[PDB]
Amino acid sequence: SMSVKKPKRDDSKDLALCSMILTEMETHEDAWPFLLPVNLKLVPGYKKVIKKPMDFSTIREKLSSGQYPNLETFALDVRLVFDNCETFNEDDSDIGRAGHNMRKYFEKKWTDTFK
């Protein structure tokens, strides 16, 4: 509350460490469905169904330009990528499986880096 603060967590490395995690996601072999925005002209259904499209390139630009106020907002957009993928893709598809794999990969890095 006013003039009563929990001890200050060092957040000065967060930007750099989120960039490294994002690099590792970008270079994963199952990243290919997620590297660029879904083409809303060429993928029937996507525009209407997926209210908040997100992809790694968009996260990378947001990161590089100070559009994440903190590391939680960064994790929200990464998770959004996988939640969108599950909304639109069957579990038993290459893209569906890619999404589950990448989410698992991300969540381990996240815990190991920050928890």
From Swiss-Prot:
What name appears for this protein in its UniProt entry?
Bromodomain adjacent to zinc finger domain protein 2B
Q: Please describe the quaternary structure of this protein.
A: Component of the BRF-1 ISWI chromatin remodeling complex, at least composed of SMARCA1 and BAZ2B, which regulates the spacing of histone octamers on the DNA template to facilitate access to DNA. Within the BRF-1 ISWI chromatin remodeling complex interacts with SMARCA1; the interaction is direct. Component of the BRF-5 ISWI chromatin remodeling complex, at least composed of SMARCA5/SNF2H and BAZ2B, which regulates the spacing of histone octamers on the DNA template to facilitate access to DNA.
Q: Which residues of the full protein are shown?
A: 2054 to 2166 of 2168
Which gene produces this protein?
A: BAZ2B
Tell me the compartments it is located in: Nucleus
Positions of the Bromo domain? 9-113
Which species is this UniProt entry from? Answer: Homo sapiens (Human)
Family assignment from sequence similarity: Belongs to the WAL family.
Function (record text):
Regulatory subunit of the ATP-dependent BRF-1 and BRF-5 ISWI chromatin remodeling complexes, which form ordered nucleosome arrays on chromatin and facilitate access to DNA during DNA-templated processes such as DNA replication, transcription, and repair. Both complexes regulate the spacing of nucleosomes along the chromatin and have the ability to slide mononucleosomes to the center of a DNA template. The BRF-1 ISWI chromatin remodeling complex has a lower ATP hydrolysis rate than the BRF-5 ISWI chromatin remodeling complex.
Note the superkingdom of the native organism.
Answer: Eukaryota
Q: In which tissues is it expressed?
A: Expressed at varying levels in several tissues, whereas a smaller transcript was expressed specifically in testis.
